[PDB]
Structures are given as C-alpha cells and as structure tokens.
Amino acid sequence: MEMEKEFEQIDKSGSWAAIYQDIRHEASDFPSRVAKLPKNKNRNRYRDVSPFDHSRIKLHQEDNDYINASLIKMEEAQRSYILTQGPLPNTVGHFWEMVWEQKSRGVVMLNRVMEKGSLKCAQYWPQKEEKEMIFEDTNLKLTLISEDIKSYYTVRQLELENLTTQETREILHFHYTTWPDFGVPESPASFLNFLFKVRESGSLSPEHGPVVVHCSAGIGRSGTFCLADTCLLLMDKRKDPSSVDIKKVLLEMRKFRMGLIQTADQLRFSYLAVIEGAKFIM
Numbered sequence: 001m002e003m004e005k006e007f008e009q010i011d012k013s014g015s016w017a018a019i020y021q022d023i024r025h026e027a028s029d030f031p032s033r034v035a036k037l038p039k040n041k042n043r044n045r046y047r048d049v050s051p052f053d054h055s056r057i058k059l060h061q062e063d064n065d066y067i068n069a070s071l072i073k074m075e076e077a078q079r080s081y082i083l084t085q086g087p088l089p090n091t092v093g094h095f096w097e098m099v100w101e102q103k104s105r106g107v108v109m110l111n112r113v114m115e116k117g118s119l120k121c122a123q124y125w126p127q128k129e130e131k132e133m134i135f136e137d138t139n140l141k142l143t144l145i146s147e148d149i150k151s152y153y154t155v156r157q158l159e160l161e162n163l164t165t166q167e168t169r170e171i172l173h174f175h176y177t178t179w180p181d182f183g184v185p186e187s188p189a190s191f192l193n194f195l196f197k198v199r200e201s202g203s204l205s206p207e208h209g210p211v212v213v214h215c216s217a218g219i220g221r222s223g224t225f226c227l228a229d230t231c232l233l234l235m236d237k238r239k240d241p242s243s244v245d246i247k248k249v250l251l252e253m254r255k256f257r258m259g260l261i262q263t264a265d266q267l268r269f270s271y272l273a274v275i276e277g278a279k280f281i282m
C-alpha cells in the first residue's frame with residue numbers, strides 16, 4: 001500500500017496512537033544484562049533505556065567496556081548507524097573513545113544542551129578555538145576548528161587527537177538546534193534539509209565507520225533520523241519503491257535498540273518526512 005494513502009487513511013481515522021501501540025506490542029525484546037550490572041549504573045542516563053547485549057558497542061579497554069550505545073545494521077539498505085544517549089559528565093571521555101575506535105566521521109546531535117529548564121546532555125565539545133578539551137581517562141584531545149551557524153542547524157569541524165599515537169582525525173559535528181521542546185516540527189522541510197547535509201558530507205558512506213547519532217535518550221528523535229534515511233535509501237534502491245513499508249523497517253531497527261520512536265506524533269512525523277523526501281529522491 002502506497003504509504004501516502006496509508007497516511008491519509010490513518011490520519012482521517014485518527015488512529016496514530018493505535019498503530020503505534022501495535023508496534024510497541026510486536027517489538028523485539030532481548031537481554032540487556034551488562035547495562036544492568038551495578039558497576040554500570042552511573043553510565044546510564046535513564047533507568048529504562050538500555051542497549052541490548054547482542055548489539056552493544058564495546059569500548060576497547062579491559063577495565064570496563066560498557067557504554068550506552070547500539071549498532072543498528074541495515075542489511076538491504078547497506079547503512080549502519082550507532083545510536084547513543086547524550087553523554088553524561090562522567091561518560092564524555094568514553095563517548096570520544098568510541099568515536100575514535102569505530103572510525104566514525106560524523107556525529108549527529110538532535111537536542112539542545114538545556115531543554116525544558118533541565119540539562120539533557122553534557123558539553124562534550126569545545127566552544128572556542130583557543131580552549132581545547134582534554135579527556136584524561138581516554139587520552140584524547142579535542143579542538144574546535146571551525147563553526148558554521150545556520151538558522152536551524154550548526155556545523156562544526158573538530159579535530160580529535162589520539163594523544164597516545166598523535167594521530168588526528170577531522171570529525172564533523174551536525175547539530176540540529178530547532179526541534180521544539182514539546183511535540184514535533186510542523187513541517188519536515190528543515191529536518192529534510194538537515195538530513196541531506198549530513199549525507200552530502202560523506203559521513204554516512206560506507207568508506208567510514210558508522211555515523212554516531214544522539215538526542216537525550218538516543219531513541220526518539222534519533223530513531224526518526226535513521227528511520228527516515230533508511231526508508232528513502234530503499235525507495236532509491238528497489239524496483240518497486242511502493243514496497244517500502246515504514247512500519248516493517250521500524251520493527252527491523254528495533255531488533256537492535258529498544259524503544260525507537262517514542263510517541264505516536266513521532267511516528268506520524270516519520271511518515272511525513274518520507275513522503276515529502278520521496279519527491280526529491282525520484
């Protein structure tokens with residue numbers, strides 16, 4: 001069924017909440033035993049949002065290899081993503097260790113450091129060129145190289161230096177700054193504009209490690225980003241683009257991280273973003 005007609009059908013019948021609970025019901029459930037270990041309690045921002053054991057990213061250190069992050073592997077689309085929580089004051093060094101060890105090129109941030117008057121994530125990057133950051137636990141240095149502030153997003157080049165080997169890499173930081181404190185955007189154009197910028201940069205291409213994407217919990221806005229990207233890539237690839245079933249792609253993604261798409265508004269917004277993104281793709 002052409003998703004554009006499925007949309008109108010769901011919209012007219014106002015059954016978004018019903019579709020969504022159906023997804024919640026059939027989603028995968030796998031163990032998350034490492035996340036729940038007592039030694040890792042201060043490495044989870046939210047008690048109810050944990051990575052599955054089978055798909056969790058492991059830090060290349062013997063001490064404690066745990067970070068709240070998951071590898072989402074989309075086999076038909078040939079796209080991989082790491083979804084993670086916003087870093088905590090004690091996990092900023094772990095975050096940049098992961099970026100280094102997975103060879104990622106890009107970091108995608110979908111939240112503001114403060115929202116609804118509370119902190120949603122730490123300041124894990126430097127705000128001035130001459131004030132670099134050093135992470136002593138993971139032996140890394142991070143320098144701001146340039147910043148590019150647009151009305152609804154900011155782009156930054158960063159330099160990550162492995163202090164143990166003095167290798168350096170350019171990392172691109174893509175920061176969507178205008179998602180509203182409550183609800184979802186009215187239109188997907190700026191989100192759509194935002195996704196193509198990430199794509200252009202090379203950050204999603206198989207020549208690099210997987211892109212790192214985060215919001216506060218790493219499941220809601222983050223799930224919307226990778227669901228829209230993968231669905232548009234499949235409509236690109238297949239002989240029959242109308243055979244792309246967004247609900248089925250989402251259930252597939254939920255095999256790798258729990259809770260992706262947090263609200264029936266977010267589900268409806270993911271549809272809108274896809275239908276409007278199809279128009280450019282073909």
Ligand SMILES: O=C(O)c1ccc(Oc2ccccc2)cc1
Nearest residue numbers: 112113114123127151154177178
């Ligand atoms: O303290 C910080 O680092 C920080 C950075 C950027 C933020 O997003 C924006 C940027 C421009 C306009 C509206 C929001 C919010 C906090």
